[PDB]
Amino acid sequence: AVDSSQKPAEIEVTRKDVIKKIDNHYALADLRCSVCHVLQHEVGQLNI
Amino acid sequence: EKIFQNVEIKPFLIDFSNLFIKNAAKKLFQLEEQLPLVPVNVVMDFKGISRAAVHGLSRVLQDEIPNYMLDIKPGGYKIEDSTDLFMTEQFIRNRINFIPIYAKNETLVFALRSLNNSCEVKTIYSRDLIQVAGPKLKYPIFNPTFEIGFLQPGKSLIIEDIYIKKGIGRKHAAFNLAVKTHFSHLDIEQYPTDKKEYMALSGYKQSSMTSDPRHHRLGLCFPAVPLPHINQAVRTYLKNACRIIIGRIQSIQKIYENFEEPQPELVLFSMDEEKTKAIITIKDETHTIGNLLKTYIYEMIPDISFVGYQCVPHKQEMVLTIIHKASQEDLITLLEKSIQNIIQTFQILEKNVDELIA
Amino acid sequence: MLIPVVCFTCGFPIGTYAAIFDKARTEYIKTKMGGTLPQNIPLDASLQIELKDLITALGIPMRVCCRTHLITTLDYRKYY
Amino acid sequence: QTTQTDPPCFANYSPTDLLDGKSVVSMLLRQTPINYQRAPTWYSEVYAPYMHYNKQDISTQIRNGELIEGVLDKKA
Ligand SMILES: [Zn+2]
Numbered sequence: 001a002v003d004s005s006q007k008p009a010e011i012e013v014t015r016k017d018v019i020k021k022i023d024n025h026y027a028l029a030d031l032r033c034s035v036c037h038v039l040q041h042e043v044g045q046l047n048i
Numbered sequence: 049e050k051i052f053q054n055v056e057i058k059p060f061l062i063d064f065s066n067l068f069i070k071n072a073a074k075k076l077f078q079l080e081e082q083l084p085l086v087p088v089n090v091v092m093d094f095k096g097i098s099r100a101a102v103h104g105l106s107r108v109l110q111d112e113i114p115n116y117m118l119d120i121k122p123g124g125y126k127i128e129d130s131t132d133l134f135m136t137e138q139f140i141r142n143r144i145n146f147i148p149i150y151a152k153n154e155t156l157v158f159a160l161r162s163l164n165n166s167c168e169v170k171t172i173y174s175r176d177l178i179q180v181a182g183p184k185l186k187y188p189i190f191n192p193t194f195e196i197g198f199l200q201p202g203k204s205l206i207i208e209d210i211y212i213k214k215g216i217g218r219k220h221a222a223f224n225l226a227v228k229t230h231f232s233h234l235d236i237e238q239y240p241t242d243k244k245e246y247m248a249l250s251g252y253k254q255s256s257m258t259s260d261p262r263h264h265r266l267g268l269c270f271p272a273v274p275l276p277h278i279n280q281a282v283r284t285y286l287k288n289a290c291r292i293i294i295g296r297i298q299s300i301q302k303i304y305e306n307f308e309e310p311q312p313e314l315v316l317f318s319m320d321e322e323k324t325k326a327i328i329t330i331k332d333e334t335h336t337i338g339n340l341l342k343t344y345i346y347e348m349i350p351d352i353s354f355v356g357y358q359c360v361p362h363k364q365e366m367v368l369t370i371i372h373k374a375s376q377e378d379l380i381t382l383l384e385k386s387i388q389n390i391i392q393t394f395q396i397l398e399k400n401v402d403e404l405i406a
Numbered sequence: 407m408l409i410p411v412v413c414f415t416c417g418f419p420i421g422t423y424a425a426i427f428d429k430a431r432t433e434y435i436k437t438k439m440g441g442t443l444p445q446n447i448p449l450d451a452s453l454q455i456e457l458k459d460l461i462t463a464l465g466i467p468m469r470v471c472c473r474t475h476l477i478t479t480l481d482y483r484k485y486y
Numbered sequence: 487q488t489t490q491t492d493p494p495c496f497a498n499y500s501p502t503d504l505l506d507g508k509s510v511v512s513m514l515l516r517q518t519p520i521n522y523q524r525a526p527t528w529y530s531e532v533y534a535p536y537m538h539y540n541k542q543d544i545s546t547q548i549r550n551g552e553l554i555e556g557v558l559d560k561k562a
Contacts (some may be wrong), residue, residue, distance in 0.1 A: 023538065087465075144418070146421045269467070271417065360488075
C-alpha cells in the first residue's frame, strides 16, 4: 500500500485474483516464488 | 468593448552581426541593409471571443483571403527562345509562383530575359525579373534575391508574360498569405509539460471536450510586407479578413432571410413532436463558416435539440443541420439573430484592429 | 534542383535567404573543416557543423520545417 | 455530427452538462437495441499484475442498447 493508513498493507495474490483483490491504492513490489517462498529481490539471500 | 487587445508586430530582419551573412550578402547581392520586403510576425491577443471566431480569422488569413500570385500567361514561356534544357516551364513556373509579392496594382506584367553569354553556370535571380507594364514600380513588390532557375553555359531562357493573378490560398497554395506561428488559450491553465508525468498530455489543465476558452493569443506571420509600411500592411490584411468573413456570413444570411421559395440550399422540415429541422447546404464552404455558425447558434440556443455541420472532403460543401423545439419562423429568427451576432463581433474586431495597430 | 522558394510545409519564404545561405554555409564549412577532403566531410568523426546561429542571423525563425528544407535541399548546380 | 443518421435529441442537456462516453454510445445503440455482456480485449490477465484496471472497464454490458459498463474494443 502506497499510503500508510491502508491497513491490509501487504497483499500476496495470484494473477487471476489480482483484479478481484487489488485496487488503485496499491503498488507492486517484487514477486514471490510459489515453491520456495523467496522474494524476487531477495534471491541473493540464498547460498550459492 | 475591446475584443482585440494589444498586438505585437515584429519583422524578421537580417542580422548583419554575423560575418558570414554580411560577406555573402555584399559579395553576391551587394546587400548592406534589410530587404525591401520583410516577413513580419504578428502576435495578437483576443478577449471575450469564442474560439470559433479566432480560428476562423486565422484560417481566413492563412488561405481564404484573396491574395495575389506571380504567374506566367500561357505562351509566355518562349519554347523557341529558351535554350536551356534543364529549366522546364513547370520548374520555372513553380519557382515564380511561390515568390511572395506585395502587389498594390494588378496590371504589373514582368518579363524574364536571361542570356548566358559565358562559360559559367549563370544563376538567374529575382533581380533579373524586368517589369514592362503598368505604372513604374517605385517600390519592388518582391525581394530581388529570389533564386529562379540557373542557366547552363551558352543557354538562354526567355519568359515574356509574367502577370499578377488573384486567388485564394485554398484552391492553390501559392495564394496562401499568412503562416501560423502561435496559438494558445490564455484563460486555461497549463501544466509544466517538461515533467515526465505531463509530457504525454497537451499541457492544458482542462479537457478539450469540456473547455470553452474565451481568451486567446493568435500568432501569424506574413511572408513579405514593405519595410516602411509594416503596420499599414498588417492592418490591411486583418481588415480584409474580417471583411471576407462578414461577406460570407452575409451571403449565408441572404438565403436565411428567404424562408419561402424553396431554393435548393435551405430545406425546412417539421417532424414528429412539433420539432423543426433545418438543413443548410453551401457549395465550396469550409469549416470556418460551419464552425462559426454552429458555435454562435449553440450560444444563442443553449437548449437546442441538435446543431451540427459536416464539411465532407468530397461533395465540397457544408451541410448544417439544426433541430429545435420551435416553429419554423421561430427557429429562422433565432438563427438570424445568431448570424447578426457573428456580423457584429467581426465588425467589432475590425474596429478594434483600426484602434489598436494604427 | 534548388532550395525551394518557400518552405514546402508552411510556405515561409526561405528562398529569399537561400542564395545568401549557400555561400555563408560554404564559408562556415571552410573554417570548421580541417585536414579533410570535401568528399570526406560527411565522413569525419571529429567534425561538428551547426548552422543554427547562421540561419537565425538570416532572420529565419526557430521553425523545424523551414530550417530542415533550407539546410537539406540539394542544389543541382553542385552535382551536375 | 457526421454519422449521417437522424441525430438524437440533446434538448434536455444544459450547455454545461457533462455527458459520459457510455452515454453517447448508448444514444447511438438505442436505435438497434441488443443485449451484450462480455469481457473486453482491453482486460487481459497477463497485464493485470501491472497497471490498475478500472473495475468499470473490465466488464462490458449492454442492455437493450444501453451501454452501461466497460469499454468497446476488438472483442465487442
Ligand atoms: Zn516552414
